[PDB]
Design a protein around this ligand. Structure first.
Ligand SMILES: [Ca+2]
Length: 888
């Protein structure tokens, strides 16, 4: 039994998916109404590896099915797979070198069009919908009463119930991480009334070799190999009748199992491929028989444990993570008097008829869903991080840019980053593990790309540890198979700062934990990528970009000239990487002596000969020196953050002429030059000069006249987080409102359109950043610095006058709870998990007005103040202790 579910968080609906509103914009690849219905109406669950999306149909029930490693492309997709790298284009770095020389000699722009790769869509591949589980009850009439379908976010399961011709039928679905198995629990209220056919057809749109569907005893097996690349796949459904009551027989089609005259059944569903994240073969080495044996043991082991035990272990595991964070903004819920279904709730929110409690319900549900979706798509033992769709998809085809939008891939120039923005602050740090492994997984294939396009060759690349090579390069479109080449067209295909950027998400695993094992891993990654940038990528700018190091030829997605002499986007990212790398080094005592200093530090130190080697072997090219020479931020003549170093007024060059390709209405969708504001620490509340300029930049991008503009997907996700960092909670909240009104389907999937999970994760992160920030550095008037200080309620919306949150995490590894009333903090609970010095700003109240206690015991806390009158409480902590901060 479920017991008391009154306090659980539910998405819920009074009708099946087929009857649920799917009228929002469908987007590319969703012209088929059935596929569009899937993305707008079905309810997801997963264990980080396998996933389902539940339709809740009355008679022909459907659970769309996924496994995270079902990927076309990679080795075996051609006779020459090499991660997309094109030697003729790269010329071992010569192409890039010559373009940079043109810029260094004074060109304002160049044509970087030859910097491409990745031409074969069959080699690139994409993520596939595996297929579907169908449970066909064979009802003559679909007419029912007492229908409900729900997703219980608290217990990590989907439910369906209805009454048909006097009989109540129930369904429950979950995917257990501990037991690595999907469970469907099916009941009828009257004995003999549970009758259904179970099948598991693979998606009919990808090519296959040697697929069979067979029944033996209580188990249905579908197995074969992908036609595109020979990847082996195997799924099994084991049907277990309660008390042996009922009859189990082979379906008349020979491709299904028939349950007759039963009352209750448990289905155990498992699936696997022979994928392995192992360069260059990307296979386990198992035979089809071995995969089959492995999957069979999963379902048998689960059945042996039994439904009650498997369910208990699942709910314990799921809730252990899910229940870490609680948030109370005054929301209604499914147990409230006059509770409204989630689709009805969304509609009311859109129409402006939702009550305050209902608005808070939708806002907190969407927030919580981002956490839920992390648990479902990204577990410690996932083989791959969440992709553009987490793990959930209905579309499939063999080739990239085919039947599935953007291949449901790893899009590493904002999207994958966004997937891992709430992971730490929302107390799910362990769930970043597959991202860390993925980025480690880019090193071997990326060393090939680094050699081809930048001339950075690692000798003995197989045995040279991460950190000790010459560099690894990867771009926007990535896959399960080390597709680290740039894409076929420069504008969208080339973006080597994607690696620096994703390294930010990786380094945050250390920032938020203080875990020395993570420190070693992130340091190794940062060491080699910093080596790569310092030695191969950076150059002294030509006259168009002033006196600084830049990253050479660069595009600012997705406006302006194709190739300028660096830009704010790339310089902000490289600056942040070197900053993180220096911090990682310092935390280890700089054993490699790479931090250096700014003594005899000049962009002239980067001088190279015709072959691309430094002419001065002994010049200072240390991380500190390189970082100091980027000068990534310049405020322009419109008080804006410059996007290009040749910029004067907004969208203009210093001579007043047009920046060709700049979107003249100032409302370009990308804000690539603001990554230093979010996620970075280049532009923070502690630097008014830069922050005022960033706010000006944001206003031009986000407003048409005086009206704040809606956006969708990654763009709205980015804007929410960016505005949160400014401290303007009202504008930030207004963007959350716009996301909910204009970028959420009935099942609360974020849309671009089509469905893109990035914005779901971006929402959760954005709410976190409104309530807690921990990325900035405070400087008191005596000059003392407090790095990564805990900032309570930095961008609290006036719309949320009172509330509480518990279980957020701040950098330095502090768990944070806060309660507020009339727009001001009444309590902060700060749990020090690692014993680091506490430094606490209370934006909504002023920390100087508060005092710190350990239970009843007064804690010595110094008040420090900066030049603008902002204060911190500074105090020692001990790991394991919670400190309570209240008004004096
Ligand atoms: Ca996954």
């Amino acid at each position: 039994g479920d017991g008391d579910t009154s306090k659980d968080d539910w998405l819920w609906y009074k009708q099946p998916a087929s009857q649920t509103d799917a009228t929002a914009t469908a987007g590319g690849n969703y012209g088929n109404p059935d596929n569009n219905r899937w993305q707008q109406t079905t309810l997801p669950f997963g264990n980080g590896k396998i996933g389902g999306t539940v339709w809740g149909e009355v008679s022909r029930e459907r659970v769309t099915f996924n496994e995270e490693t079902l990927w076309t492309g990679g080795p075996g997709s051609s006779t020459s797979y090499n991660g997309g790298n094109n030697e003729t284009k790269g010329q071992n770095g010569a192409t890039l070198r010559a373009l940079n020389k043109q810029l260094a000699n004074g060109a304002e722009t160049v044509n970087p069009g030859n910097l491409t790769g990745g031409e074969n869509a069959a080699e690139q591949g994409n993520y596939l919908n595996w297929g579907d589980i169908y449970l066909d009850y064979g009802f003559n009439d679909t007419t029912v009463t007492e229908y409900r379908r729900d997703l219980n976010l608290s217990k990590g399961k989907a439910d369906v119930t209805f009454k048909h011709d006097g009989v109540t039928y129930t369904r429950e679905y979950f995917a257990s991480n501990p037991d690595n198995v999907m469970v469907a629990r099916l009941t009828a209220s009257k004995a003999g009334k549970l009758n259904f056919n179970v099948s598991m057809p693979t998606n009919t749109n990808y090519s296959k070799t040697g697929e069979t569907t067979t029944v033996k005893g209580d188990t249905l097996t579908v197995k074969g190999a992908l036609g595109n690349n020979g990847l082996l796949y195997n799924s099994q459904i084991k049907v277990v009748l309660d008390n042996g009551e009922g009859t189990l027989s082979e379906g008349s089609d020979g491709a299904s199992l028939k349950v007759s005259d039963a009352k209750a059944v448990t289905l155990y569903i498992a699936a696997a491929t022979d994928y392995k994240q192992k360069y260059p073969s990307y296979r386990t080495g198992e035979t089809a028989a071995e995969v089959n044996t492995r999957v069979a043991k999963v379902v048998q082991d689960a059945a042996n444990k039994g439904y009650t035990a498997v369910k208990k272990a699942h709910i314990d595991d799921h809730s252990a993570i899910y229940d870490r964070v609680k948030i109370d903004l005054g929301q209604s819920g499914h147990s409230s008097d006059g509770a409204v279904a989630t689709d009805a709730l969304l509609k009311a929110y859109q129409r402006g008829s939702a009550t305050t409690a209902q608005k808070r319900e939708l806002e907190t549900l969407v927030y919580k869903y981002g956490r839920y979706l992390t648990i479902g798509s990204s577990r410690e033992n996932s083989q791959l991080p969440s992709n553009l769709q987490g793990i959930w998809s209905v579309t499939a085809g063999d080739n990239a840019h085919g039947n599935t939008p953007w291949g449901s891939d790893f899009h590493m120039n904002v999207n994958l980053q966004m997937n891992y923005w709430p992971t730490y602050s929302a107390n799910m740090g362990e769930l970043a593990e597959p991202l860390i492994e993925y980025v480690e997984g880019l090193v071997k294939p990326g060393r090939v790309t680094a050699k081809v396009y930048a001339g950075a060759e690692t000798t003995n690349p197989e045995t040279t540890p991460i950190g000790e090579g010459e560099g690894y390069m990867a771009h926007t479109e990535n896959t399960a198979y080390g597709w680290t080449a740039p894409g076929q067209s420069f504008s969208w295909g080339w973006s080597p700062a994607a690696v620096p950027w994703i390294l930010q998400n990786v380094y945050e695993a250390y920032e938020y934990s203080g875990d020395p094992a993570l420190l070693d891993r992130v340091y190794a990654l940062l060491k080699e990528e910093s080596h790569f940038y310092v030695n191969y990528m950076l150059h002294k700018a030509g006259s168009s970009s002033g006196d600084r190091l830049t990253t050479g030829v660069a595009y600012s997605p997705e406006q302006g000239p194709l190739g300028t002499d660096g830009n704010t986007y790339e310089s902000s990212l490289v600056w942040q990487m070197l900053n993180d790398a220096i911090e990682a080094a310092k935390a280890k005592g700089d054993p490699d002596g790479l931090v250096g200093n700014t003594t005899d530090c000049s962009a002239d130190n980067w001088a190279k000969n015709d072959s691309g080697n430094f002419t001065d072997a002994n010049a200072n090219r240390s991380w500190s020196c390189a970082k100091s020479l980027l000068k990534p931020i310049e405020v322009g003549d419109s008080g804006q953050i410059k996007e290009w170093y040749f910029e004067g007024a907004l969208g203009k060059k210093k001579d007043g002429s047009t920046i060709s390709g700049y979107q003249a209405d100032n409302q370009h969708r990308h804000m690539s030059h603001l990554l230093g504001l979010f996620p970075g620490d280049l532009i923070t509340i502690d630097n008014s000069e830069y922050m005022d300029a960033a706010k000006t930049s944001l206003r031009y991008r986000c407003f048409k006249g005086n009206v704040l503009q809606s956006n969708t997907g990654w763009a709205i996700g980015q804007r929410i987080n960016s505005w949160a960092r400014t401290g303007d909670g009202n504008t930030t909240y207004q963007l959350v409102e716009l996301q909910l009104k204009n970028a959420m389907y009935a099942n609360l999937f974020d849309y671009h359109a089509p469905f893109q999970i990035d914005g779901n994760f971006g929402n959760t992160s954005g709410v976190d950043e409104m309530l807690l920030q921990s990325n900035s550095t405070f400087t008191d008037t005596a000059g003392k610095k407090y790095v990564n200080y805990t900032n309570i309620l930095p961008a609290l919306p006036d719309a949320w006058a009172g509330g509480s949150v518990s279980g957020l995490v701040a950098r330095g590894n502090f768990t944070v709870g806060t309660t507020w009333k009339n727009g001001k903090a009444t309590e902060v609970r700060l749990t020090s998990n690692k014993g680091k010095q506490a430094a606490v700003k209370i934006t909504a109240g002023g920390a100087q007005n508060y005092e710190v206690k350990n239970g009843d015991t007064a804690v010595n806390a110094k008040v420090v103040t900066n030049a603008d009158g902002a204060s911190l409480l500074v105090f020692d902590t001990t790991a394991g202790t919670t400190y309570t901060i209240t008004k004096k």
